[PDB]
Structure formats: C-alpha cells, structure tokens
Amino acid sequence: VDRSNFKTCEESSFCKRQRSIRPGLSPYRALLDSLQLGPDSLTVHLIHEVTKVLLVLELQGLQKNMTRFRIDELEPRRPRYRVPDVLVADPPIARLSVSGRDENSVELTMAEGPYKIILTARPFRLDLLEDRSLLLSVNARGLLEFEHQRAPREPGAWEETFKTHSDSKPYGPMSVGLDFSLPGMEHVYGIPEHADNLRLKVTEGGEPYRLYNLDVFQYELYNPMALYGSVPVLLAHNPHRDLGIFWLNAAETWVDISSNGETPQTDVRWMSETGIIDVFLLLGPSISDVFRQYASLTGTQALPPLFSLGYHQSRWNYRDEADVLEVDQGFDDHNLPCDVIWLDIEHADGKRYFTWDPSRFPQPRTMLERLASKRRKLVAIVDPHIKVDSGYRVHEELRNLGLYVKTRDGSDYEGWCWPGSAGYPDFTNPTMRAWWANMFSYDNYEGSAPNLFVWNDMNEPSVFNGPEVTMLKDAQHYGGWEHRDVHNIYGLYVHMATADGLRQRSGGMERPFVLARAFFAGSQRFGAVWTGDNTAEWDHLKISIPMCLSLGLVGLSFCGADVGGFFKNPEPELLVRWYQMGAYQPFFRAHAHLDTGRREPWLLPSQHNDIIRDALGQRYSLLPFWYTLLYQAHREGIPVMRPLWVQYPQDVTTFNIDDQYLLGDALLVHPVSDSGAHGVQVYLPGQGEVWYDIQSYQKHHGPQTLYLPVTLSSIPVFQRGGTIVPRWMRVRRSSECMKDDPITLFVALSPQGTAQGELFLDDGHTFNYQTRQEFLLRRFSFSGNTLVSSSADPEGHFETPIWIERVVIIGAGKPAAVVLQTKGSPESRLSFQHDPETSVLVLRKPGINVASDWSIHLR
Amino acid sequence: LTNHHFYDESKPFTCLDGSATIPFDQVNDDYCDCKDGSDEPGTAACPNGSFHCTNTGYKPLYIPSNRVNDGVCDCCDGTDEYNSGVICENTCK
Ligand SMILES: *[C@@H]1O[C@H](CO)[C@@H](O[C@@H]2O[C@H](CO)[C@@H](O[C@@H]3O[C@H](CO)[C@@H](O)[C@H](O[C@H]4O[C@H](CO)[C@@H](O)[C@H](O)[C@@H]4O)[C@@H]3O)[C@H](O)[C@H]2NC(C)=O)[C@H](O)[C@H]1NC(C)=O
Ligand SMILES: [Ca+2]
Ligand SMILES: [Ca+2]
C-alpha cells in the first residue's frame, strides 16, 4: 500500500474543519412558532444563534416502524444535491399528531402505535421514545454543523492543492455533519468495504472510517481507510433492541465511533462534504425487522441465475482461444466441475471493447457455440472507460451526442489510460445509460451469444493520472452537478446500465448476471460484488469472513473474494485451505496475476487434487440449498451468509465472533484459517440444542466450545438439529444437467424429534417465476415420526422431472415398518437401513415427484 | 453397459465387492444400492462407476458415470443420451 496517495482527515479540508468542533452546547435552535404540521410531513425552521442562518427541518414517519428527517437551507443560492434512483419508490407515510405541547419541547406520536418523537427548541434536539423507553438521541452533544452557501468569490475553505493536482472549489465550502447517540448499546456494525473486523472499533485515537469509492492498490488489513465500495448503513445491536441508521448522501463521508443524555454508551458521527441532511432511522425492534425495513427502503437482492452459483475459473493470461479449449478439456478430463470461464482485458482489441481482435480470437461466436456445446458460459470485462480513437466508433458516437463528463473549463475529460488515452462518459445522464444498455444488443456486440456475459471493473471510476486514483472533484456532470456530488453513484449507475443492457438484449426474458467492483446502497438489485484484489496470505483468509459478513448485513448477500489471492502466488496448503474456505461462500472464483503462474485444480499435486475435487463436489451438491437461500434473500432481504448473533440475539459471546458464520439457519461453518493447525475450536450456541457434524454425524450439545482436530481434508461444518436440507448427490460437469436430477433430503432431528425445511425450484435462467408465476416452493415438516410435504406458496405451479430419491434421518431409532402415502394410491413399503453406532437411518427410493405432496410414516 | 455376461436371470445380482446383496429387480432402478456402484452400470445414479460405451470404431473405453444423460455426447455411438433426448450420430471412423 502507499498511504501518500490517499488523504487523511488533516489533508481533507472539510474533515479537519468539522472535527475541530468540540462537543458542547449547540448554537442551532428551533423556533416553535414557525412549525407547520401536515398529513404528509412536519416542517420547522431552525436558526443559528451566532451567524443567523435559517434552515428547514422536514420530518416524516414511515410505516413498518421507520422515520426520516431532512435538513436543508431555506434561501439557497443554488439547490443542493438530493440523491435519486437509490430508493425504489416513495415510502408510505404514517400520520404524525401532536401528543403534548410545552414551551421548550413538543412531542408527536409516530402513528396509531407506541412510538413517539420529542423535539426541543433550545438547544435543538430530537428524542425517540418507544412508549417510555429512550431509543436514541439526535444532536445530543451539539455536533451539528451546516456550512451555508458562502459568497460567490482561511486555508481549506476554497481551491486546494493535492500532491500535484489542483482541486478548485467554485462554490466554496458546503460541509454537513450530524451526531447520534444510542444509549444502552455497545455493538455497532455496518459501513462495509473496510479491511477490518466485523465489529467496528472506536476512532478517537485514529482516523475516522472513510466512505469514498477508491481504487486502493495492494491494500492492507485492519485500517479505517476507504476501499472500492461504500454503503452508509449502520446497525446497532442490543440483547433486547436493534436499531439502524441510513445516511443517504453521495459525497465523501467520514464517520466517527465513540463510547460514553450525558451517558450514551455508543456515539456515532457523520460528516459529509456536501449535500443536504437526509437520515433514515429504523426502529427495529428486531434484526429481521431492520433487515425488512432496509429491504423495503432500498429494494432487495436480485435473484441470480443458477449457473452463477457454481465454480468460476478466471486467469489473466488467457492468450489464445485455444487456451480456453485447453482449460475446458482439463476441466472435463480430470473430472472437475466448472460453470463459467472468464476473460481479462487481453480479449479486447487493444482495450477497445464491444469487439474482438481478429488475430486475438479468430471467431468468437463459433467458440461460444463450442463452449455452449459443453453447457458452459463465458464472461468478458467491460470497463467504463474507452479509447479515444477516430476509428473506434464508440468514442465518435458518444462525442457527437455529447454524453461525456466535462472538465473544469467545459472541455472533455480525457485522463489517459495506458494505451493512448481514455475518455469517461457521464453515467449520471439517463440518455447515456439508455445508449449503454442499447449497445449490448446481439447485432451491436459482435460475436455475441446467450452464454456470454459481462463483468464490470474499475467503475469507481479509476483514473490512472488524477487526484488519488479517482476523478477530479470539479468535473461538471449532467444537470449542472459537480463530481463531488455524484462520486458514490457512478458505480451504481454503471452496474444498473450493464444489468439493463444484458436483460434487454434477450427481450426482457433471461436473467442477467453483472458482477461489479464499486457500488452503493441499492446495488444489490443489479447483481453481485467482490472484495477487490486481495493478496495470498493467511491474514487475508482470516479477514475474508468479516468483509462478506458486513456486505451481507446491508443487503449485498452475494459476496465473495478471489480464490488463491491476487498478488504473491500462494503455497499449495494455503491454496487448498482457501478452496475449502470459498466452497462455502456465495461467490466462488479463482483469479491470478501476470507475474504469477498457472494454478489450476489439475495442476496441483496429486494428494491435493482429491481434496480440491471433494471441495468442488461439496459445493456442487449443496446447490438447491444455496438456491433456496438466495430465493429467500430475494423475497425478504435477510442475508444468506449471516453472523451468529442474528439467530441468537441474546448470547453475548456471539457478539464478537467472526471466525465462524451461518448459512441461513441450518449450517454452521468454521473453516480452518491457520497453517498446519492440529485442530480448531468451534462455539456451539443454543439453550438445549444439538448439532451434527457432516462427516461423522456426531451429536454435540450446546452451548460450548468444541475442540475438534482437523486434517488437510477437513472442512468443519455442522447441521443444526431440527432442519431439512436438500442436496444433489450426483456430480455433473456443470450445473445444467443437475437441473433435472433427483433430490436427496437430509433431516437433522431436534431433541424433541421435529424438523422443518424449504426448497425452491425453477428453470433457473428466466423471469417466468414473476410473470406467469412458474415456480415451485415446497415445505417439508418432520413431526413425531411422520414426515410430510406441502406447498409453502400455493400459487406456485411448476412441472419438473425431479423425483426424491433418498431420505436421510439423523438421530432416530430403527423402525419396524416404513410406509409411503400419496394422493389416491395404496400405501407401499420402503426398504431402509439403520446404523446403530451413529444413529442414522436411510430410506431408499421414495420415487415420488417433488411437485406432488406425500407423507412418510415410521413405525 | 457391463461388457461382461453376469446374468440376472437365475441368481439375484449378489455383488462384486462382496459386502451387500440385492435382488436382480433392483438392478438399473436409478438407485445405487451397492457402495461399489456395480448395480447401476448403465445409469448415472452411482457417484462412483463407469459406463462401457459400445461402438464399432477405434475407441472402446469407459466414461465416468456422470456422463450419462447429461445432454452432451461423450462416446462415439450416441448411447449416453438414450434417455436424455439429445439425438446424436456416431462418428466411428
Ligand atoms: C413495529 O413495532 C412494534 C412495537 O415494538 C412491533 O410489535 C412488537 O413485536 C415484538 C416482537 O414480535 C413483540 O415482542 C414479543 O412480545 C411477546 C408478548 O409479550 C413476547 O412473548 C415475545 O417474547 C418471545 O420471544 C422470545 C425471543 O424470540 C422467545 O424466547 C420466547 O418465545 C418469548 O415468548 C416478544 O418479546 C411485541 O410484543 C410487539 N409489540 C406490540 C405492541 O405489538 C412490530 O413487530 C414492529 N413491526 C415491524 C415490521 O418492525
Ligand atoms: Ca439399484
Ligand atoms: Ca453424455
């Protein structure tokens, strides 16, 4: 890493000028005579005691236990930026009525409900009450700062200068800031894309956490510095409560965490360069409740196609098209499952996208057809920066229309990429997004096949020669807005445009899959993300879990990381350990570098080959479980890879655990994260709860810390007692033959002898489950000694050839007669096998279709 | 599918490893009764197994059991997709 190319709070002018304010009495106050209560909202005017500047506070109560408040100037020289396209729709409004009135304070009921808000005049302060219980306070310490619009003409209040770049400020300083205090809570998570632990540490002896999209080259761990993504969502957890803060602003953000209405045990402070104050408060009272509230606010995760859930193979140095054939034949020759092969920037004709160099790849469409003959997909890179050429018609078409980012003096921003130069289009313009989407047509994109997809990189955007590694802040975008206003929405706009283009190229039928690096709040509706370029170290293997956990805590369920690292090619043991780690993650892809070598599963040593193949088989067998988890995340917003305290919100020990995670509510995963460790300690929570390891089916009671020995072929995974998991036990080349393969059910009985599970089935590559309602949602329930199946959603009709082929029951005695009952048919007898030592029972060949409900009785 | 004359007519199909015994009705019922996978030679049910494709060309060899009914031709004669539906023609020359 090079910390010289990145700003601290001292180098950043607005952070320095805003953190100079010590906590104390606030000059801002509320005038209660100029208060207007309407059915839509509440409006009040605030004043500054010293400089006498009028501001407007607008407060709204939103249903499902939410509220939203905005602060903005009353007479501005020009309007400030309000972030569009992040919220899916206008949230519903809950009527506010004045409950009580006092000379200094006025209290309003939230709705026909228990919540209420108290607003005080001198000093201005907002308090949230759940009946008589305080939830959080606004402007408790008097840290509110609102730099008003100065005269259109002290260091740092005007045109600054970076190491070699001059950043002008034509409109002057417009910094905003606020503080919130949450009494009784000591655990706060969120603000993802920081190479840190799951639990955010206090930032009083160091720099604040930075939300700013940047391309950090060779980043390190355990730092509060910014990274590729930025999601301004904070979640504060308590054994009895759970609250959420959403800071809707697209500018550079610095957030401070402190510990201490003079005793709030956790304080948060937000500081932004520009914009208005737009804050969403989520009042819980549960973690699933705030998850659903944020899902209703900024949408849910888009349902991915089934092939994207498999193993992705990528390598920078895919020189010829025969190299792809060699990789495919190696995959199909050593019996290694694979779904998608990826291409880096080498495929483009000298960085010229939307085309193929004839010498590079002779016939791309024929190669795509050959790959589809083996039922596999190809993915190409498309960057949001293009070459400035007179023959490359993308530049000329974009220039004639005028869809570029303009520089300081009105010219065209032409920061040069390594071949020749490069231009940057203005993705904020909706017309530019429409043109970008229309450019993904089969007629437009040459050599285009339905089995070819696009992944976006360097969508921060990343300028090779500029301030930090990003664009200048004085660039003028569409609508007369500066780049400092719309920096954090560029990646979201690129991701949305690519997703719209890929879904429009098929007539709105097929499901697109767009994988992007930079993002913002609401990007989960357009695809997936990854944790940049990480080097191959054991420390990065340890830190791979908290980053994905933080990403999933804010709706980005489909997290992942590069397998084997990016720099510093790994040792075989570290490679095998990372393969085992990534076999239980939402995204699974191997990446390399030019200076590295060829690390492929077939090129590994023979002893490690079997372990890698077993890990791939375990990943491919759990495909129905992953698909059901992603469907649940798409329909509700609850993350797939969630921490331990989500399922157990009353166990304090789980409050600081990032070594192990939960895949839904059935599988507990604690992968090995050490070099040659003789064993691992796994914490099993639950008051009178059992867990069964996948390998030996040994039953362990909770809560405790089990020290289990491990080897090179050990992946510690436990199934929770009282769950049902579907699996595909036949390995196939890819994930398309398995679409019509039989299902095996694994039942982990609770101590009371009950279990429950769900399954979701579809064709996996279309939108038919929404338009014509063509999907299959099945629910399996084991009660007493009877296992029944039913329809979780009755309006889901789907015809599938899949039949249930085997039943596995864990923790049950041997039966004397196992029968099967169906609709309008005589009951038959099924042969079974029982193992007394491990107490497992196997029911052989039910031979019944999944779409038809049945019942299995055990005597 | 077996390339050997192990009859299921008179005796039930006992075993090849020697551990488990089954009747001949359970052979080729799309369920893997034996751990060796010998009870499903021409079926993809067995995780471990083979499928002796028959052809008149120059490539008599086994294929992995998961190559049966996968929609992709893997042998000379189109015998792996006999139940899949993907029609194939032999290139045995
Ligand atoms: C919007 O806010 C309202 C008001 O807070 C909220 O309604 C509340 O929901 C919670 C959670 O469902 C309720 O709390 C429950 O109350 C019952 C009755 O006292 C208790 O028995 C419950 O405890 C059970 O749960 C424990 C933990 O799971 C278990 O160990 C055990 O089984 C306990 O029996 C639980 O505390 C609360 O009563 C309501 N309040 C009202 C007024 O309805 C609503 O859900 C929120 N909605 C959204 C969408 O956020
Ligand atoms: Ca059989
Ligand atoms: Ca085949």
CB A514 within 8 A of CB A486: no
Ligand nearest to the CA of A289: 1
> Of B31, B47, B66, which is closest to A805 when you measure between CB atoms?
B31
Q: How far apart are CA A838 and CA A208, in angstroms?
A: 53
**A496 and A503 in contact (C-beta within 8 Å)?**
no
Protein residue whose Cα sits closest to atom 49 of ligand 1: A64
Q: How close B71 gets to chain A, by Cα (Å)?
A: 7
Instruction: Decide if A845 and B29 are in contact by the 8 Å CB cutoff.
Output: yes
Give B-chain residues touching A805 at CB under 8 angstroms. 30-31, 45
Would you tell me the crossing angle of helices A430-438 and A490-504 to the nearest 10 degrees?
A: 40
Kindly determine whether residue B71 and residue A729, on different chains, have CB atoms separated by under 8 Å: no
DSSP notation for A708-743: EE--TT---EEEESSEEEEE--S--SSTTGGGG--E
A376 touches chain B (CB under 8 A): no
* Closest CA of chain B from A376, distance in Å: 11
A772 burial (CB, 10 Å; 0-12 / 13-18 / 19+) is exposed
What lies within 8 Å, CB to CB, of A752 at 6+ separation is A722
Q: Pick from A505, A552, A502, A503: which is nearest to A529 by CA?
A: A552
The span from the CA of A147 to the CA of A145, in Å, is 6
Give me the residue label for tokens 């700013």: A212
* Residues of chain B positioned with their CB less than 8 A from the CB of A742: 30
Of A630, A640, A587, A605, which is closest to residue A342 (Cα–Cα)? Answer: A587
Quote the CA–CA distance of A527 and A538 in Å, as a whole number.
29
In angstroms, how far apart are the furthest CA atoms of chain B? 42
- A730, A806, A844 ranked by CB distance to B66: nearest: A730
Cross-sheet strand order for the sheet of A840-849: A828-829, A818-821, A855-858, A786-791, A776-783, A754-761, A723-727, A743-748, A803-810, A840-849, A832-835
Q: Give the number of whichever ligand sits closest to the CA of residue A66.
A: 1
Q: Which ligand is nearest to the CA of B81?
A: 3
Q: Are B69 and A737 in contact (CB < 8 Å)? A: yes
Ligand 1 neighbourhood includes A774 CB (under 6 angstroms):
no
Distance CA B66, CA A87 (A): 46
Which active-site residues of A does the annotation give?
457, 533
Q: Does A150 touch chain B (CB under 8 A)?
A: no
Distance (Å, whole) CA A425 – CA A422 = 10
Task: Report the half-sphere exposure of A172 (CA within 13 A, side-chain side).
Answer: 11
Interchain CB contact of A334 with B (< 8 Å): no
- For residue A681, the number of C-alpha atoms closer than 13 Å in the C-beta half-sphere is 5
A793 close to ligand 1 (CB < 6 Angstrom): no
Backbone angles phi, psi at A799, to 5 degrees: -100, 120
Please tell me what resolution, in angstroms, this structure has.
2.9
Min Cα–Cα distance to chain A from B37, Å: 12
Taking an 8 Å cut-off on Cβ atoms, the answer to whether A731 and B70 are in contact is no
The size of the A-B interface in CB pairs under 8 A is: 35
What are the φ and ψ backbone dihedral angles of A77, each rounded to 5 degrees? Answer: -65, -45
Contact A715, A584 (CB under 8 A): yes
Six token digits for residue A307: 């092939």
**Secondary element (H or E) of residue A491:** helix A490-504
What is the spatial distance between Cα A193 and Cα A160, in angstroms, rounded to a whole number?
Answer: 28
Q: Give me the residue label for tokens 């609401």.
A: A522
Ligand 1 centroid – CA A285 distance (Å): 8
Distance CA A801, CA B5 (A): 33
Ligand 1 in contact with A735 (CB < 6 A)? no
Q: Are A128 and A182 in contact (CB under 8 A)?
A: no
Nearest CA to ligand 1 atom 38: A285
B33 annotated to a ligand binding site: yes
- The angle, 0 to 180 degrees and rounded to 10, between the axes of the packed helices A623-636 and A287-298 is 70
Q: How was this structure determined?
A: cryo-EM
Q: What angle do CA A320, A323, A328 make, to 5 degrees?
A: 145
Do residues A553 and A192 lie in contact, with contact meaning Cβ atoms separated by under 8 Å?
yes
From the list A21, A7, A31, the residue with the least C-alpha distance to A147 is: A21
Domain ranges within chain A, ordered by starting residue: 1-285, 286-637, 638-721, 722-859
How far, in Å, CA of A196 to CA of A344, rounded? 29
A247: CB partners within 8 A, 6+ apart: A232, A233, A234, A253, A255, A270, A272, A278, A279
Strands A661-663 and A377-381, by their bridges, are: unpaired
HEC secondary structure over B7-31: CCCCCCCCCCCCCCCCCHHHCCCCC
Distances (CA, A) of A442 to A344, A380, A500, A502, A730: 21, 15, 14, 10, 35
Kind plus residue range of the DSSP H or E element containing A781: strand A776-783
- Structural contact between residues A313 and A327, judged by C-beta atoms closer than 8 angstroms: yes
Task: Give me A558's structure tokens.
Answer: 């489909």
Q: Measured between beta carbons, which residues in chain B are less than 8 angstroms from residue A731? A: 47, 66
Between the CA of B91 and the centroid of ligand 3 the distance, in Å, is 15
In order of A444, A506, A734, A739, B68, the CA distances from B63 in angstroms are 41, 36, 16, 21, 9
CB contact under 8 A, B33 and A844: yes
Which of 67-126 (A) contact B at CB < 8 A? none
Cβ neighbours of A242 (radius 10 Å): 24
d(CA A722, CA A746): 10
Asked if residue A804 lies in contact with residue A846, where contact means CB atoms within 8 angstroms, the answer is yes
Residues with Cβ within 8 Å of A133's Cβ and at least 6 positions away in sequence, in order, are none
Backbone angles phi, psi at A455, to 5 degrees: -120, 140
Q: Is the CB–ligand 1 distance for residue A64 below 6 Å?
A: yes
Cis peptide before A605 (omega within 30 of 0): no
Q: In ligand 1, which atom is closest to the CA atom of A283?
A: 50
User: A285 CB less than 6 Å from ligand 1?
Assistant: yes
